[PDB]
């Protein structure tokens, strides 16, 4: 999902590449370092956002996400969720989902 004019959860709600982006991409398997026995929750992500992030925009706001019109006020409940979610990391996970 990382590329000019892409879509998806991580692209829209986390990191997006503008259509004119001239840079490059590099990735390698971290399963031998990040992933450990029992799981590593230190690496999280933003699951829900009221809209799509703009090009080269970073928002760390932890404010609760409101799905409907039901007030939240920072208290989890019906139609109220916590946007940040932790990536499950263990060495037994499939290569496709390896960090």
């Amino acid at each position: 999902q990382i590329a000019p004019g892409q879509t998806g959860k991580i692209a829209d709600y986390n990191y997006k590449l503008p259509d004119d982006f001239t840079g490059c991409v590099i990735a390698w398997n971290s399963n031998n370092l990040d992933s450990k026995v029992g799981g590593n929750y230190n690496y999280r992500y933003r699951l829900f956002r009221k809209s799509n992030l703009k090009p080269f925009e970073r928002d760390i706001s932890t404010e609760i996400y409101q799905a409907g019109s039901t007030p939240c006020n920072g208290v989890q409940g019906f139609n109220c969720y916590f946007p940040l979610q932790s990536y499950g990391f263990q060495p037994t996970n499939g290569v496709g989902y390896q960090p």
Partner: protein, 597 residues
């Protein structure tokens, strides 16, 4: 603003939280089965309860999103399972007492045993003890002692525990707006929301009953042939138009007749196909057994196995220090982690079982891209059906000669294949009557059509009419036959085995039409053919996200189950059995009994 947006939001966050707890719950069971330790036994309960209570907590929020305002089919299917409250609908007492009955009935099954009448000191448990002895036992009294005495302390003692299981489970179906508990299992086939593909729950009783009528002419000939070979042993108790004893079926419950293949061999003067002696000379181990099967899925176009799959496999049991269950099982946890726990010896069955155990893993790879709640087979019969089509292709002499197991000069003719069809017929044609018989009985008892006193009266009354089996010793309503069965005592679906036979054969006939194979069906081999894999891969990745009636049309082109592929694959055997039964009477009568003369 609309409930649709709120429903999809609840479903997106549910897959992530459920995938983490579900993976840890299944991972805990893996370490418990691979190694028996005090730490793994507790981890399975903690991880199992954490995931079990997760659905109970999510079910409360799932009932707050009615499905009437959701116009998406994929959204309602995900919430269809979450809308169910499980045991929450039951009363506090009925909810807690239900687990006690399941654990009590399951404990007596494993702890149940029958002491040797001749050796009161030695007392052998049913599994393996009672299941192994009854397999090769040719004695009339030896088989009757363990078969008759088991249900005395089991069937009779499990009757009060089974009665509660019937009343408790019914309260759950009524709270779910189901006609009865019997309709609860039929809900797996329920199809609604698509015009023209709708499948009613009650339609299953008519399909299973309508398709069984066409199997009668094939089973009647197969039953008359088995009774002719065994008629010389006991002509008094075995009548020509009567039924065969219930304890002579070859095992405890008479589920599979494969054990009788030895004495039922039509031709003993010709060799049989076996890879045991061939693999020994080739010097192959469990490491190369799975590797040879992995190349088979690649020939049809299916992706290979991940590196972690073959590295984490368990090829044997390292003694009693670290012990595991040798029962072949395909464990799918999540996050791309696939493993198989089996004890791998050198045999012709392990090679065929390798393709079956790998079929489940290969089947889980197609729909793995679907949501957590959308990852599953279209029904309960497609799980083991997709794995049987792979084993049927390996048992063909063409596939064995390809890799070099069977000699290239081996003569293949009618005498050679006729003996092979009989071996597969006992395991296939033998389970069908027993499956429709036992499954139909549970639906009648749960529906309330059979009073408590007629449970056993209707059990054997319908047994001679369906499978044509009579009881040597008459039993009263105290005994419970299904109570001793594994699936009946463990609260598992017993109907999935009947439909598996019709589904595995439909794909066999459809996949062979894409590969353009000619000749008999049992001669077909899907290896080296990449056209059949592309057609089956479409449905493999669909899972239960789409109605099984629609997905089945894209493969075999049928909207329901059909027995036609059952007659063609068994056609060569039916033509031969019809001639051998001319001197005997085809069929049986329900008015004959071994104790009634």
């Amino acid at each position: 603003s609309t409930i649709e947006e709120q429903a999809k939001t609840f479903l997106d966050k549910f897959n992530h939280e459920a995938e983490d707890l579900f993976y840890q719950s299944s991972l805990a069971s893996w370490n418990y089965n691979t190694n028996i330790t005090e730490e793994n036994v507790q981890n399975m309960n903690n991880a199992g309860d954490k995931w079990s209570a997760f659905l109970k907590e999510q079910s409360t929020l799932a009932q707050m999103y009615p499905l009437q305002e959701i116009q998406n089919l994929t959204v309602k299917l995900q919430l269809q399972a979450l809308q169910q409250n499980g045991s929450s609908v039951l009363s506090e007492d009925k909810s807690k007492r239900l687990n006690t009955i399941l654990n009590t009935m399951s404990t007596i099954y494993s702890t149940g045993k029958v002491c040797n009448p001749d050796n009161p000191q030695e007392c052998l448990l049913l599994e393996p003890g009672l299941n192994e002895i009854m397999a090769n036992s040719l004695d009339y009294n030896e088989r009757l002692w363990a078969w008759e005495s088991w249900r005395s302390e089991v069937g009779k003692q499990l009757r009060p525990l089974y009665e509660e299981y019937v009343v408790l489970k019914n309260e759950m179906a009524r709270a779910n707006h189901y006609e009865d508990y019997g309709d609860y299992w039929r809900g797996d086939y329920e199809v609604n929301g698509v015009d023209g593909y709708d499948y009613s729950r009650g339609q299953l009783i008519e399909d299973v009953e309508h398709t069984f009528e066409e199997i009668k002419p094939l089973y009647e000939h197969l039953h008359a042939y088995v009774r002719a070979k065994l008629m010389n042993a006991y002509p008094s108790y075995i009548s020509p138009i009567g039924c065969l004893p219930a304890h002579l079926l070859g095992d405890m419950w008479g589920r599979f007749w494969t054990n009788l293949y030895s004495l039922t061999v039509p031709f003993g003067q010709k060799p049989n196909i076996d890879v045991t002696d061939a693999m020994v000379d080739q010097a192959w181990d469990a490491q190369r057994i799975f590797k040879e099967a992995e190349k088979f899925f690649v020939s049809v176009g299916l992706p290979n196995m991940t590196q972690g799959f073959w590295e984490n496999s368990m090829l044997t049991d390292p003694g009693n220090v670290q012990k595991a269950v040798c029962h072949p099982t395909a464990w799918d946890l999540g996050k791309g982690d696939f493993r198989i726990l089996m004890c791998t010896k050198v045999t012709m069955d392990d090679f065929l079982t390798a393709h079956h155990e790998m079929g489940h893993i290969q089947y889980d790879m197609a729909y793995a891209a679907q949501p957590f709640l959308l990852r599953n087979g279209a029904n309960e019969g497609f799980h083991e059906a997709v794995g049987e089509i792979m084993s049927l292709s390996a048992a063909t002499p063409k596939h064995l000669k390809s890799i070099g197991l069977l000699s290239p000069d081996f003569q293949e003719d009618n005498e050679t294949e006729i003996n092979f069809l009989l071996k597969q017929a006992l395991t296939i044609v033998g389970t069908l009557p027993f499956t429709y018989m036992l499954e139909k009985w549970r639906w009648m008892v749960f529906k309330g059509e059979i009073p408590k006193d007629q449970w056993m009266k209707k059990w054997w009354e319908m047994k001679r009419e369906i499978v044509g089996v009579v009881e040597p010793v008459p039993h009263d309503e105290t005994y419970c036959d299904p109570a001793s069965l594994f699936h009946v005592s463990n609260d598992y679906s017993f109907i999935r085995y009947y439909t598996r036979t019709l589904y595995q054969f439909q794909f066999q006939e459809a996949l062979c039409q894409a590969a353009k194979h000619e000749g008999p069906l049992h001669k077909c081999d899907i290896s080296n053919s990449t056209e059949a894999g592309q057609k089956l891969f479409n449905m493999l990745r669909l899972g239960k996200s789409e109605p099984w009636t629609l997905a089945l049309e894209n493969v075999v082109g049928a909207k329901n189950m059909n027995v036609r592929p059952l007659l063609n694959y068994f056609e060569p055997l039916f033509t031969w059995l019809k001639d051998q039964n001319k001197n005997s009477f085809v069929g049986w009568s329900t008015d004959w009994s071994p104790y009634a003369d």
